[PDB]
Amino acid sequence: AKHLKFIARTVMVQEGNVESAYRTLNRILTMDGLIEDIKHRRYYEKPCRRRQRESYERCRRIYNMEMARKINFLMRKNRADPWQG
Amino acid sequence: ATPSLRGRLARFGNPRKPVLKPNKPLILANRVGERRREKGEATCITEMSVMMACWKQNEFRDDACRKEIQGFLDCAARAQEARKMRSIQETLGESGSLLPNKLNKLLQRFPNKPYL
Amino acid sequence: PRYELALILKAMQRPETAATLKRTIEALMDRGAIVRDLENLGERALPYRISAHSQQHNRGGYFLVDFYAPTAAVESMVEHLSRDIDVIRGNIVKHPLTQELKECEGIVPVPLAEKLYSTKKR
Amino acid sequence: NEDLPISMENPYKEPLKKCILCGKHVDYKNVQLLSQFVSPFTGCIYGRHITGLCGKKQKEITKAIKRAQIMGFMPVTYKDPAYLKDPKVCNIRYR
Amino acid sequence: VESFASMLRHSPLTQMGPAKDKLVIGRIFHIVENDLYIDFGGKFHCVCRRPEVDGEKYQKGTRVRLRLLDLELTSRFLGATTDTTVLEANAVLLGIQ
Amino acid sequence: KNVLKIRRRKMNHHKYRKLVKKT
Amino acid sequence: KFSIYPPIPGEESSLRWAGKKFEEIPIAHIKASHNNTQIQVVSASNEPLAFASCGTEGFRNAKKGTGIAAQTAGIAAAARAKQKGVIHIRVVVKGLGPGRLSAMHGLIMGGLEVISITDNTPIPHNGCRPRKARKL
Amino acid sequence: REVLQLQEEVKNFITRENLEARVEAALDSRKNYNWAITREGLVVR
Amino acid sequence: DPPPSTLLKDYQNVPGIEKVDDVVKRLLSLEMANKKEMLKIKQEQFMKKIVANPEDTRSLEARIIALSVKIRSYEEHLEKHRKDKAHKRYLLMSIDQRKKMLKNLRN
RNA sequence: AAAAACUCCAGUUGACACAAAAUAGACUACGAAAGUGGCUUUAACAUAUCUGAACACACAAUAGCUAAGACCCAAACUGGGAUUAGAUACCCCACUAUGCUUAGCCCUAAACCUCAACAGUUCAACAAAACUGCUCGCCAGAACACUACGAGCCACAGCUUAAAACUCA
Ligand SMILES: [Mg+2]
Ligand SMILES: [Mg+2]
Ligand SMILES: [Mg+2]
Ligand SMILES: [Mg+2]
Ligand SMILES: [Mg+2]
Ligand SMILES: [Mg+2]
Ligand SMILES: [Mg+2]
Ligand SMILES: [Mg+2]
Ligand SMILES: [Mg+2]
Ligand SMILES: [Mg+2]
Ligand SMILES: [Zn+2]
Numbered sequence: 001a002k003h004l005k006f007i008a009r010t011v012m013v014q015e016g017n018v019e020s021a022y023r024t025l026n027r028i029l030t031m032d033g034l035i036e037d038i039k040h041r042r043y044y045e046k047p048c049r050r051r052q053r054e055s056y057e058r059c060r061r062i063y064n065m066e067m068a069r070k071i072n073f074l075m076r077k078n079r080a081d082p083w084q085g
Numbered sequence: 086a087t088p089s090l091r092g093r094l095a096r097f098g099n100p101r102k103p104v105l106k107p108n109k110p111l112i113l114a115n116r117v118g119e120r121r122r123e124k125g126e127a128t129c130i131t132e133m134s135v136m137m138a139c140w141k142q143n144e145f146r147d148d149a150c151r152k153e154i155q156g157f158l159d160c161a162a163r164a165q166e167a168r169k170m171r172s173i174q175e176t177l178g179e180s181g182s183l184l185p186n187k188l189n190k191l192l193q194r195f196p197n198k199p200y201l
Numbered sequence: 202p203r204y205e206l207a208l209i210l211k212a213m214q215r216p217e218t219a220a221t222l223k224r225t226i227e228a229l230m231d232r233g234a235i236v237r238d239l240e241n242l243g244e245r246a247l248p249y250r251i252s253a254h255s256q257q258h259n260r261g262g263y264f265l266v267d268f269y270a271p272t273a274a275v276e277s278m279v280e281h282l283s284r285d286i287d288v289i290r291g292n293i294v295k296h297p298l299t300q301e302l303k304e305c306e307g308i309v310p311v312p313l314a315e316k317l318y319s320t321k322k323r
Numbered sequence: 324n325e326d327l328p329i330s331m332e333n334p335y336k337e338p339l340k341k342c343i344l345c346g347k348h349v350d351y352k353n354v355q356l357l358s359q360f361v362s363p364f365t366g367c368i369y370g371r372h373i374t375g376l377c378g379k380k381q382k383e384i385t386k387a388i389k390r391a392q393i394m395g396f397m398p399v400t401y402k403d404p405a406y407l408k409d410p411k412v413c414n415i416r417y418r
Numbered sequence: 419v420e421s422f423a424s425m426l427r428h429s430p431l432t433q434m435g436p437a438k439d440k441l442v443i444g445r446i447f448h449i450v451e452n453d454l455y456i457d458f459g460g461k462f463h464c465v466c467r468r469p470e471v472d473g474e475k476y477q478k479g480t481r482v483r484l485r486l487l488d489l490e491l492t493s494r495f496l497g498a499t500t501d502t503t504v505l506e507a508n509a510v511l512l513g514i515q
Numbered sequence: 516k517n518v519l520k521i522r523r524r525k526m527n528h529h530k531y532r533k534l535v536k537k538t
Numbered sequence: 539k540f541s542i543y544p545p546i547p548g549e550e551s552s553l554r555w556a557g558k559k560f561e562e563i564p565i566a567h568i569k570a571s572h573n574n575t576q577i578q579v580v581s582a583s584n585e586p587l588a589f590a591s592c593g594t595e596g597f598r599n600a601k602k603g604t605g606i607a608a609q610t611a612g613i614a615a616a617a618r619a620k621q622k623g624v625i626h627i628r629v630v631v632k633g634l635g636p637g638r639l640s641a642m643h644g645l646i647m648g649g650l651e652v653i654s655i656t657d658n659t660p661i662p663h664n665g666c667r668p669r670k671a672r673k674l
Numbered sequence: 675r676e677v678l679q680l681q682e683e684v685k686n687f688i689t690r691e692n693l694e695a696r697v698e699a700a701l702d703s704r705k706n707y708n709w710a711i712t713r714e715g716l717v718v719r
Numbered sequence: 720d721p722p723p724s725t726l727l728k729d730y731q732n733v734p735g736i737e738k739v740d741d742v743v744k745r746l747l748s749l750e751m752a753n754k755k756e757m758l759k760i761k762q763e764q765f766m767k768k769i770v771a772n773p774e775d776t777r778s779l780e781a782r783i784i785a786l787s788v789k790i791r792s793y794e795e796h797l798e799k800h801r802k803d804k805a806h807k808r809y810l811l812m813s814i815d816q817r818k819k820m821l822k823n824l825r826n
Numbered sequence: 827a828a829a830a831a832c833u834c835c836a837g838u839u840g841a842c843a844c845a846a847a848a849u850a851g852a853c854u855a856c857g858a859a860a861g862u863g864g865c866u867u868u869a870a871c872a873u874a875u876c877u878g879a880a881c882a883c884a885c886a887a888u889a890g891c892u893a894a895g896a897c898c899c900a901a902a903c904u905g906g907g908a909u910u911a912g913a914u915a916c917c918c919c920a921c922u923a924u925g926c927u928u929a930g931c932c933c934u935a936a937a938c939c940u941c942a943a944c945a946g947u948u949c950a951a952c953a954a955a956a957c958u959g960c961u962c963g964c965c966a967g968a969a970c971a972c973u974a975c976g977a978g979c980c981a982c983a984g985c986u987u988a989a990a991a992c993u994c995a
Contacts (some may be wrong), residue, residue, distance in 0.1 A: 209395060243396075247395065248395075248397060248398035248403060249395075249398045249400070251395065261395075263396075265352075273380065290394075290395060292394055293387075294351070294390075297348070298348070299349050302348065303397055305341065305345050305377075305379075306347070307339025307340050307341040307345060307377075308340050308342065308377045309339065319399060
């Protein structure tokens with residue numbers, strides 16, 4: 001309210017590229033974590049279940065990060081088999 | 086870069102309370118989750134919008150609808166050929182993304198073990 | 202201990218600004234404070250709109266003072282600046298450097314925890 | 324006997340990494356430094372994985388950010404437009 | 419007679435020290451149509467991809483100089499009681515001979 | 516794990532509450 | 539070279555539209571919801587120019603919260619703005635909804651030029667308690 | 675030795691008659707605390 | 720109940736309190752500082768009153784007097800906050816330990 | 827999806843709360859636990875051998891009662907509108923008790939991380955590896971039984987303690 005308008009969470013159209021502007025808006029806002037927050041705050045979510053969901057998200061993040069790590073670590077190994085026999 | 090998990094779980098030597106309580110035991114499996122579809126195909130929304138427009142203006146006059154209906158048919162054909170293109174692309178293999186089948190192959194060639 | 206008063210007045214002319222400042226430091230001396238020094242931040246446009254006791258102000262004048270005073274002087278000055286309308290805002294805080302900065306030896310590498318689960322083939 | 328190894332410190336040890344503000348001081352008044360570590364669009368404080376500094380300094384800087392916000396030195400919604408042409412330290416990907 | 423402790427103290431590897439960003443000469447023993455494996459030193463050979471520039475000058479017995487990071491690529495994961503390895507070594511080349 | 520014990524106890528407590536509010 | 543950030547009343551703004559500065563250009567407001575979206579056109583100085591919505595267009599309960607009705611309302615409001623004599627427009631959006639993306643394309647096809655899009659959506663910092671989660 | 679600092683700084687501490695000079699000097703002068711830091715950790719103003 | 724104007728502990732060995740300004744003396748008075756300075760001044764006072772060998776914290780009676788002044792501080796905190804059950808329990812446990820050490824000292 | 831409801835309705839702009847305090851938080855800190863994650867100030871976070879009262883004392887999540895008040899929002903109950911053969915519910919709209927500040931009472935939870943404190947070491951299955959020395963507390967088939975009787979409590983449809991009879995393998 002007190003803050004001025006047309007500064008925060010904005011996107012300036014260039015060459016009338018409205019779809020690209022909207023895509024960059026989605027990208028920045030999802031990287032900052034707002035749309036998820038609002039679709040969660042739509043309906044009230046109790047503290048216990050919110051804590052459970054958040055722990056689930058932490059575990060998922062750790063698991064997927066380890067998965068990506070091992071993928072990037074062992075993708076170089078996947079090449080043409082030099083030693084057939 | 087990864088977040089540490091020294092005393093997040095309920096362990097004997099961990100005096101304080103636990104933070105995390107995963108349903109399944111955290112062991113990196115030798116199988117990776119296969120990809121999934123995103124949503125249901127939709128196309129031609131602006132085409133059918135201009136079609137309904139020119140319809141309500143011209144009282145279903147085909148010779149005046151010519152351009153709207155031509156654009157609509159062309160966009161439908163583009164959607165069909167794009168579906169076929171992306172199908173053949175997903176079959177031959179996603180470029181930039183690593184395939185689940187060969188991911189599983191790599192993981193079974195170099196699998197991890199929780200045990201000794 | 203040390204107390205830093207961050208103060209925000211309304212954008213107005215030097216005579217009345219000096220009047221407000223001298224009366225504020227007179228209130229300090231009455232409470233029993235001893236001012237170390239005064240630091241002028243200057244006149245600047247406030248980022249977000251605010252509401253005074255009876256009006257609103259988009260700009261303001263940021264000043265800073267640091268002093269030594271007892272505890273009751275703190276609440277006395279807080280209520281004084283709340284009652285005063287010429288003071289758009291006044292906030293007391295402790296001094297950061299008075300707290301000895303703990304020597305920093307850098308970020309230690311965290312090794313991956315192990316022995317989460319017993320040795321079982323499953 | 325002389326050629327045998329010996330218990331000894333590790334001189335190959337690279338010095339411990341220190342964040343850019345590990346040694347420096349941070350206060351609630353350095354609006355420039357405090358708006359450096361915050362979203363320009365949404366105004367939220369970036370996480371540690373985006374920032375890349377020690378937890379003590381992260382706590383101190385976020386506390387100072389909130390203090391400046393509640394005091395009035397800084398807003399919460401939109402970063403100050405004057406401090407946008409500053410060194411970008413927090414790694415981003417949207418551009 | 420010479421003690422193995424003396425031979426190790428005088429070894430090329432103890433004077434080599436850390437493999438992090440250190441030039442070394444090596445040669446190849448096996449080469450696939452797209453990649454070549456240089457036997458450079460220590461236990462493991464280092465795999466590498468042929469550069470399109472000067473790609474012809476890559477045959478058996480070629481003395482290629484290159485830097486490296488480590489002698490063995492390994493990493494410890496969550497459920498890895500023992501760190502998993504690659505049986506290879508990462509290395510970057512910028513010249514030959 | 517199974518919860519038949521607490522289900523029996525729940526039903527008995529419910530019946531006791533009903534009889535109490537009745538009498 | 540292009541600056542994605544919007545201009546500021548403090549100098550310098552090196553880009554005008556129709557020989558006009560960013561501030562005085564009219565602003566369009568979109569309020570999106572799962573059931574319906576509401577559109578409005580206002581001057582830079584709070585003066586409303588045109589107003590429309592799916593209900594005013596004549597869409598029923600199931601059809602209010604869709605993208606097609608959003609496109610039709612956008613076309614309508616853009617026609618109103620063009621009849622008034624407005625070429626450029628600064629977009630402002632509020633909340634999620636089906637026709638959120640559709641209203642902008644509707645305005646464009648109606649013949650307006652969107653300069654910037656601001657996500658002026660409400661966000662409570664644990665202020666109020668919404669309704670409980672419904673079970674279906 | 676620590677007593678040395680705050681003892682001589684008493685002269686810098688304002689008083690009743692020094693008020694109508696220090697207040698004016700401060701409001702005439704300007705001061706800024708802002709300073710940024712680059713990637714490697716060098717102060718920039 | 721020491722006076723407020725009494726300067727800090729650490730600035731007692733130094734002979735510079737006579738030369739230094741009275742404004743600095745007031746600044747160094749404990750009334751400017753928090754209650755822990757007064758607490759430690761009272762601890763030193765009880766020491767000089769009672770103990771034969773000062774600056775010996777390991778002594779049973781030294782610990783007793785320290786915990787007693789801490790208990791009186793907690794008492795004041797409680798008359799300021801009749802509601803603080805945390806500090807109520809802290810005081811109760813402190814006096815329990817105090818009675819324990821009093822009886823073992825009697826033995 | 828629809829119905830019902832309001833049009834003193836809906837949208838922008840300007841002012842306004844005793845309501846709860848995104849992001850940081852991918853942080854693991856404090857408190858004995860219950861809990862504490864908007865900002866500032868105050869006071870302050872025990873015991874430098876360990877254990878230990880269910881004959882005591884002090885707290886004890888949410889809910890509830892007593893007397894004042896506070897009114898954005900939510901919501902039991904309730905009313906109404908949908909659906910169902912039926913729906914005393916799940917779907918939708920309105921609202922109260924209540925969630926809040928005071929002075930008290932009630933003293934219970936999957937109060938579980940169901941893994942006791944202290945000082946230490948390196949296999950029933952599942953779960954969170956196997957253990958050592960000492961200490962307090964708890965347990966001895968299911969159900970009857972978070973029950974009856976008795977005793978205490980500011981509690982009166984209650985709480986704490988806690989059986990017995992009969993039946994069965
Ligand atoms: Mg489970
Ligand atoms: Mg958070
Ligand atoms: Mg007990
Ligand atoms: Mg109540
Ligand atoms: Mg009420
Ligand atoms: Mg609990
Ligand atoms: Mg238990
Ligand atoms: Mg015990
Ligand atoms: Mg019970
Ligand atoms: Mg009973
Ligand atoms: Zn640091």
